[PDB]
Amino acid sequence: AYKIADSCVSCGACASECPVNAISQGDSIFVIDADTCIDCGNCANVCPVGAPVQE
Numbered sequence: 001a002y003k004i005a006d007s008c009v010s011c012g013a014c015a016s017e018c019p020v021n022a023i024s025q026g027d028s029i030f031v032i033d034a035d036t037c038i039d040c041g042n043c044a045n046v047c048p049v050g051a052p053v054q055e
């Protein structure tokens with residue numbers, strides 16, 4: 001599991017994209033239920049700026 005890191009702008013276009021919908025806007029930008037994310041590569045594949053990357 002990763003984070004939506006600071007590369008993220010609040011663009012929205014990954015929330016619904018996660019097969020397990022393990023995403024929402026959280027701290028400031030998008031966020032991941034990292035518990036519940038499995039390292040599937042989707043989201044990371046979709047994000048215009050590849051922000052699904054870790055804390």
Ligand code: SF4
Nearest residue numbers: 018037038040042043
């Ligand atoms: S890597 Fe896959 S399971 Fe994890 S948040 Fe992204 S889309 Fe969802």
Ligand code: SF4
Nearest residue numbers: 008009011012014047
């Ligand atoms: S697609 Fe990328 S930039 Fe858009 S909300 Fe998701 S992580 Fe942030």
